Design a protein around this nucleic acid. Sequence first.
RNA 1: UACUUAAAAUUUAAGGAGAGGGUAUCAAGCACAUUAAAAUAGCUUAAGACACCUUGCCUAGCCACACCCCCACGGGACUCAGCAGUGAUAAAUAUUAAGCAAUAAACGAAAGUUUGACUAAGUUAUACCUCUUAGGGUUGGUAAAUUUCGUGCCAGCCACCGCGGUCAUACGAUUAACCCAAACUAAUUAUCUUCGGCGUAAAACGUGUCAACUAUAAAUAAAUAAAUAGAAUUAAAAUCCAACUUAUAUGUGAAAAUUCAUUGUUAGGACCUAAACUCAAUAACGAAAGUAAUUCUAGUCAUUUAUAAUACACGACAGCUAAGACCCAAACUGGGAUUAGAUACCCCACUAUGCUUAGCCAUAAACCUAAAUAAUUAAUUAACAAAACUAUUUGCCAGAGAACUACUAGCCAUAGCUUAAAACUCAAAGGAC
Lengths: 108, 136, 72, 170
Amino acid sequence: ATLNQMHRLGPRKEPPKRLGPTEGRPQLKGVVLRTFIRKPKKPNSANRKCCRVRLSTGKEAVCFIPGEGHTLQEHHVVLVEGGRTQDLPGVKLKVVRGKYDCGHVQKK
Amino acid sequence: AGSRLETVGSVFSRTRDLMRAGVLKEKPLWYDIYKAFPPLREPVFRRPRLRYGKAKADIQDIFYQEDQIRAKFFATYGSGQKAFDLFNPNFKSTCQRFVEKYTELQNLGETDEEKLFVETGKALLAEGIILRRVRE
Amino acid sequence: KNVLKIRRRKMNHHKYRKLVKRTRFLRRKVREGRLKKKQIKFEKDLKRIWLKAGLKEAPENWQTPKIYLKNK
Amino acid sequence: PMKGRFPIRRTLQYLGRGDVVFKESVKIMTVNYNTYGELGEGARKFVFFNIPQIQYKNPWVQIMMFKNMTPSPFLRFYLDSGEQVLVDVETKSNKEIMEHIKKILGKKEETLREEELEKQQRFHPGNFGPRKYCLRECMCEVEGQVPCPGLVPLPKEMTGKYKAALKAST
RNA sequence: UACUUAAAAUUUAAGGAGAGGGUAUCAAGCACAUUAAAAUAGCUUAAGACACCUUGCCUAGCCACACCCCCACGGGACUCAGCAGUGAUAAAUAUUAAGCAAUAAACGAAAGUUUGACUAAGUUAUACCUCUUAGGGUUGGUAAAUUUCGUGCCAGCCACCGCGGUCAUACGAUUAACCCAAACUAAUUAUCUUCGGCGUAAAACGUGUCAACUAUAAAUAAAUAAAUAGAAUUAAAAUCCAACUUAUAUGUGAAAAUUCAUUGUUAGGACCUAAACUCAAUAACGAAAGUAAUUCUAGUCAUUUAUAAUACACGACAGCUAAGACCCAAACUGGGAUUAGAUACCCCACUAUGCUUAGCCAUAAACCUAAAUAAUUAAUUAACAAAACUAUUUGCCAGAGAACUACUAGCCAUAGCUUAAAACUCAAAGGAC
Ligand code: FES
Ligand SMILES: [K+]
Ligand SMILES: [K+]
Ligand SMILES: [K+]
Ligand SMILES: [K+]
Ligand SMILES: [K+]
Ligand SMILES: [K+]
Ligand SMILES: [K+]
Ligand SMILES: [Mg+2]
Ligand SMILES: [Mg+2]
Ligand SMILES: [Mg+2]
Ligand SMILES: [Mg+2]
Ligand SMILES: [Mg+2]
Ligand SMILES: [Mg+2]
Ligand SMILES: [Mg+2]
Ligand SMILES: [Mg+2]
Ligand SMILES: [Mg+2]
Ligand SMILES: [Mg+2]
Ligand SMILES: [Mg+2]
Ligand SMILES: [Mg+2]
Ligand SMILES: [Mg+2]
Ligand SMILES: [Mg+2]
Ligand SMILES: [Mg+2]
Ligand SMILES: [Mg+2]
Ligand SMILES: [Mg+2]
Ligand SMILES: [Mg+2]
């Protein structure tokens, strides 16, 4: 672009930073609604443990539960955090182990 | 260990550099000779490029003043029936004798080209040279 | 130079043309209603002007032109 | 590569090299120059190289330039009194034009220095406060003075916590 | 605070050199002007008006707000956005504390009095500082550092690339190392922001003309090869009609259907529909699209040069509207073959349509995939294409797909064109060799 064209337009317009599943917040608190299994998109093979939750904002999201074995059930309370599960498409939230009803993984 | 880079610098500069580096401990025998009696131009690599646009070479067409007279003689009489001998360094052709006489008359002060061309033909005719005015 | 990018656009346009053909009658009714709402919005915007200016009736001999109807 | 011809003209150092600071009377400087010709070459160079420097040092002066309106280039200054100073810059180098206008309508070096000193009259080295305005924020920074309690803990007897305990003890 | 008249601090009102968030799919606002007999018809705006959305900024500090109704006569859902504290809510968690001793403010002539300002404390790894203890994470690559076993595409793991189906340095447990350390790791947020590009990768607009700026500096142009429009004209080959005439004609790789209302000849007649061989191995004209059978008429030409849209005029083919034309070609359709099928490729027939005259439509791989203009050819090989490269002006581009899409506005367009997003998905997509 010419110097006249750079002057008439100025600095590049910056698209706004749209928020993610946590809505620009470190964590959210949600109530478990259902516990189910999700299948990782190929080339991976597993039965990943997930749960649906109703977040404090009022929306409902799918959250991956990390660790080997959880005791979560419906009506439990959990603290979710950000971070996508790479193989699980659409799962953009995770549960925090050791907060509210969710507990630390039982060591073997 | 050497400098096989013939596109940067020259054989002399690369040999100068190798000795400064410390890799070449003995001067080549041709080195001091080049230092004392170098070439006119440094032998450095240059990539030939084509000329583009309106760039042109600088070569003068070699045309002496005798050629104006010689062109007329070949158009009027062609090449002399006597054959050119280009091995004799002092050969005098029929056309060269015409141009020598044509010059002599012009020194006298004749200003008309037509006068100098028809008078020269008469002079050579007296000399006995066989000039054929071959239009063909 | 392959034509792969042209083939993606080729399929999108082919499928889109068949979608419009299937729902041609529905799309016609959407348009006639979108134009009607477009006309009402035009009339209301003209009524806002004279009412704000303080007139209680539209200027004498004025009838809002119907500009979106099948006049041509 | 910086765009345009002579990109050095678009540097703060070049703009600050201008030496013509007009007197307060000068309000407008109209520049009439011709884009084609031989006697106007210095004028064209003056608009190219010098007009930016003049505007940088005289932000409140209106410089308006007109092209190819007259046979010869000239400069006309409009003063606040209503006087009009016409300058003829034909056959004159751009440097010569700058020197001419500096002499007739330029502030002297003495005047400019005096204004600079007056501007800084209210800054005092002894004054304490924020870094933007002062050298030192607190007297604790000075050598020999009691240091800041955050950096160096104060003696117990100089602390309100300790003094309060004694008053209760008394 | 001074004088009978002047120095400040602090404000208020009317303004304007310049600067000042986002969306142009917000493009028009609709009285937003001037004059001063009261007329004139103006004012703002692509150099961004107006509309909408978001946000405290100018930081020794400033601005706005003070239960709500912008305001607060009034009305109402009737007061901690003063200190501490509570309910609810939230990922978010300080004392319902002491003193007016210091400074500040208020009052008083004053000794003085008052103050949840403030001072000194309480609370909290949020930060810094001094000490003392040691914990936290990591160990496939990027990136410092793994022993053994268990598991066997399961259980699990990853910021990216990826790991796990029997010897897993990548999972879990151990072992040893590595990093940081009173912290350590996770999530969230913020800090880095245009002098780069546009033949083939995103990107030069289908074409030209007129403005205002920014640049440039010359004084010409045109001067019968196919621009364009109108009228007239016609050689070849078809078609129709007629005479004569084979028995078949037509068609394919081979067949079938079709046909004998055919076929072949005509130095016979009519027709002027449609299209213009050779020339053309040419490279002209025109802004582009486009234009080449012949003749005649009208006609291209000077702005220094580049640079234009929201205006104007054009714009292959296909398509639409009305009235005509019709030799041949031909979507569709019907008939015949082929094939597992053949809604096709091949055969035959015949429409819309290609033609004229009016109007619309405004799209092309509208592509030399090269914006225009003026220089230079050396002080220059990413690859390929079409050698490199400077300057000027405008346009355009900012990972891929979603998307020649949704919505918006304009349009003779109505299954349309131009304008043109986001969610969401992916870690690539793409160009050359
Ligand atoms: S900053 Fe000076 S005493 Fe703390
Ligand atoms: K795998
Ligand atoms: K208020
Ligand atoms: K006090
Ligand atoms: K093993
Ligand atoms: K491990
Ligand atoms: K381990
Ligand atoms: K092309
Ligand atoms: Mg598609
Ligand atoms: Mg929209
Ligand atoms: Mg109020
Ligand atoms: Mg309140
Ligand atoms: Mg109050
Ligand atoms: Mg409070
Ligand atoms: Mg906190
Ligand atoms: Mg007092
Ligand atoms: Mg792990
Ligand atoms: Mg790892
Ligand atoms: Mg492209
Ligand atoms: Mg069929
Ligand atoms: Mg037909
Ligand atoms: Mg187009
Ligand atoms: Mg073309
Ligand atoms: Mg299209
Ligand atoms: Mg569309
Ligand atoms: Mg649309």
